[PDB]
Amino acid sequence: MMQEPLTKERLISDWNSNVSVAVARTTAIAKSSDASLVQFLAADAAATTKSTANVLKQIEPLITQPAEREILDKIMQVRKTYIASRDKVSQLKADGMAEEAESTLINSYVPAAQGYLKLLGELLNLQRASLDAKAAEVEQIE
Amino acid sequence: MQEPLTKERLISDWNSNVSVAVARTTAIAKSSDASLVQFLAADAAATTKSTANVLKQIEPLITQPAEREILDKIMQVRKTYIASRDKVSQLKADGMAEEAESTLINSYVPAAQGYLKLLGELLNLQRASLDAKAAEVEQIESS
């Protein structure tokens, strides 16, 4: 019972950490004049990506509420926009197109990452609220 | 239940901050751009302040021998981690790219790995306590 929202809270926390890491890395890539940084960080980026893939596969079978499914649907859509803009920033920086990379970071990547993190926060708060309610019942009702 | 849950959430935020800082410092050390240090200074300071606030909240809640022992070890290694992080940033800002990369590999990465390993152990202490309590609840409700 309780372990359901507990497990989902932990998985979503890992996911949120992965996105925060990826945002810091993409920000550093976009602000560095070094066109080679993308390739230097490719292995780290791949580890972050695969970590999130693992989280997603674990979260999917645990989704039990319509609200969770709607939020997750929105997350996956926003995530598509985020991935496209992240990849565009990396491509432009690798090609030395610093100005266009900045335009993309500001107009596309930042809003997508912010929406991504906001929706992850909503799903996380959903789990935390369910778990907090059950924990309060267990403590008080005893 | 609320005690280990609060600690688990605070430690999760802490761990996220450390992972972000490690990614940022790695990017700084691998970039040929000496200016990245200054460009990311505000973000790095915000990560630092976030962890400081987490520590202020978690310290009074860490009361039992095992968690206190792990926390003491974390703070010890964290001293080395901070020193090496600051060294990496300083060498990069000073144009000592080669020395900054060497410091990243020989000093910063080992400290960061020990820091993250001990944070993971503290987090797992909280998670194991919560798992045990939740399982006890499921047992009671099953009878």
Residue numbers in the entry:
A (entry chain B): 57 to 198
B (entry chain A): 58 to 200
Give sentences copied directly from the paper behind this entry.
Here, we determined the three-dimensional structure of MCP2201-LBD in complex with the repellent malate at 1.8 Å resolution and found a malate-bound MCP2201-LBD dimer in the asymmetric unit, similar to that observed in ligand-free MCP2201-LBD. Malate was bound at an internal pocket surrounded by all 4 helices, which overlaps with the citrate-binding pocket. Residue T108 forms a hydrogen bond with the 2′-hydroxyl group of malate. The significant difference between malate- and citrate-binding pockets was that the ligand’s carboxyl group (coordinated by residues Y138 and R142 in both cases) forms a hydrogen bond with T105 in case of malate, but in case of citrate, this residue is not involved in ligand binding, but instead 2 other residues, R81 and T104, form hydrogen bonds with the ligand. Residues S69, N72, and S73 were involved in a water-mediated hydrogen bond network at the malate-bound dimer interface, but not in the ligand-free dimer interface. We propose that the malate binding induces the displacement of helices α1, modifies the dimeric interface, increases the dimer formation, and then alters the orientation of the helix α4 C-terminus (via the dimeric interface interaction between helix α1 in one subunit and α4 in the other subunit).
We also identified a binding site for an attractant citrate in the MCP2201 LBD, which, similarly to Tar-LBD and Tsr-LBD, adopts a four-helix bundle fold. Here, we identified malate as a repellent recognized by the MCP2201 chemoreceptor in a bacterium Comamonas testosteroni and showed that it binds to the same site as an attractant citrate. We found that malate and citrate affect the oligomerization state of the ligand-binding domain in opposing way.
